[PDB]
Structure 1
Amino acid sequence: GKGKPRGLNSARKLRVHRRNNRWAENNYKKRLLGTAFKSSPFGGSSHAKGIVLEKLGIESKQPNSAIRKCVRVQLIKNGKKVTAFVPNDGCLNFVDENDEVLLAGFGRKGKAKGDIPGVRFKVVKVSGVSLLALWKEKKEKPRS
């Protein structure tokens, strides 16, 4: 009988079984528990502003050896600390001190992208001016 009940009055059994077995899905469980609004760093939001705090002695994944910086950021709405990855060459000019940086996800819905372990976010704006605008030299960060 292929497992599942087939009776014409077994609709309640089928619905309840489906309700119970929906929970095995990763995204359905997150949606119905509100894990975005309780424990996601961004509070279920696409982007998040933050204040870059300090340097931490972290090491990149395979293959490299690069310990210069990866921005620790304190969010404004949550106050939580997240590590973000400055997404272009010449990261030095934009991490001066206590800057306000806008952060987006890395694109994997909450997972690390590549050779960067434990980093789920990237920087798109530095004090209201776009990071790739500074990278392409087409706009200037406020120096006065």
Structure 2
Amino acid sequence: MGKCRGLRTARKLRSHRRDQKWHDKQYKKAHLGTALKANPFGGASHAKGIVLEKVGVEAKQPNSAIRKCVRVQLIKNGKKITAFVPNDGCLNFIEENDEVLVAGFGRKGHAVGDIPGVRFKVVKVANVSLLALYKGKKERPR
């Protein structure tokens, strides 16, 4: 309680709630829209780009590994993202200065696992999925 409970206090309630909703964390990203503007995506699930150069990222402690990322610039916003390559040895199935299709990690703007600075992964290298390259259901077209 600690609040008015008149029968004519609809205004003082409905204007108060509309204000104290802005302090909520979820709401403040959704409704200012600065989230979208800042994102390298337009708010689309995927996006398409062109590879710039392979890189390797050294994982945050205590784990030690090299995580074989790429760096890609996008078509639809012309700006750059550092993107993970999943499975094993799929670095080889990516070849520089071609198109790729990117996709978010699965934690909505926040780095996943022990790798820092990488919020994206890669799905298609030339209309052929990393899954099908790895399994052998399709082959890289050269």
Are residues 4 and 127 of structure 1, via their aligned partners in 2, closer, same or farther at CA, if it must alter by over 3 Å? farther
Task: List runs of 5+ in structure 1 lacking aligned partners.
Answer: none
Pairing 1:138–2:130 present: no
Q: Secondary structure at the match of 1:94?
A: coil
Question: 1:100 corresponds to which residue?
Answer: 99
Q: Is residue 56–residue 69 contact of structure 2 (8 Å, CA) maintained in 1?
A: no
Q: Is residue 41–residue 80 contact of structure 1 (8 Å, CA) maintained in 2?
A: yes
CA distance in 2, matches of 1:140, 1:61: 34
Question: 1:111 corresponds to which residue?
Answer: 110
Q: Secondary structure at the match of 1:19?
A: helix
CA distance in 2, matches of 1:100, 1:116: 24
The percentage of counterpart residues that share the same residue type is 74
Matches within 5 A, 1:13-28: 13-28=12-27
Question: 1:126 corresponds to which residue?
Answer: 125
TM-score (norm 1): 0.89
Question: After the TM superposition, which of the residue ranges 41-50 and 25-34 deviates more from structure 2?
Answer: 25-34
- 1:22 positional shift: 1.0
Question: 2:65 corresponds to which residue?
Answer: 65
Q: Which amino acid aligns with 2:76?
A: K
Question: After the TM superposition, which of the residue ranges 57-66 and 92-101 deviates more from structure 2?
Answer: 57-66
How many positions carry a matched residue from both structures? 141
CA distance in 2, matches of 1:44, 1:70: 22
Question: 2:90 corresponds to which residue?
Answer: 91
Question: 1:55-82: per-residue Cα shift (whole Å, max 9, x none)?
Answer: 3463222301327x31111011011101
Task: List runs of 5+ in structure 2 lacking aligned partners.
Answer: none
TM-score (norm 2): 0.90
Q: Secondary structure at the match of 2:27?
A: helix
Q: Is residue 74–residue 80 contact of structure 1 (8 Å, CA) maintained in 2?
A: yes
**C-alpha RMSD of matched pairs (Å):** 1.6
Q: Is residue 57–residue 115 contact of structure 2 (8 Å, CA) maintained in 1?
A: no
- 1:106 positional shift: 0.7
Are residues 45 and 17 of structure 1, via their aligned partners in 2, closer, same or farther at CA, if it must alter by over 3 Å? same
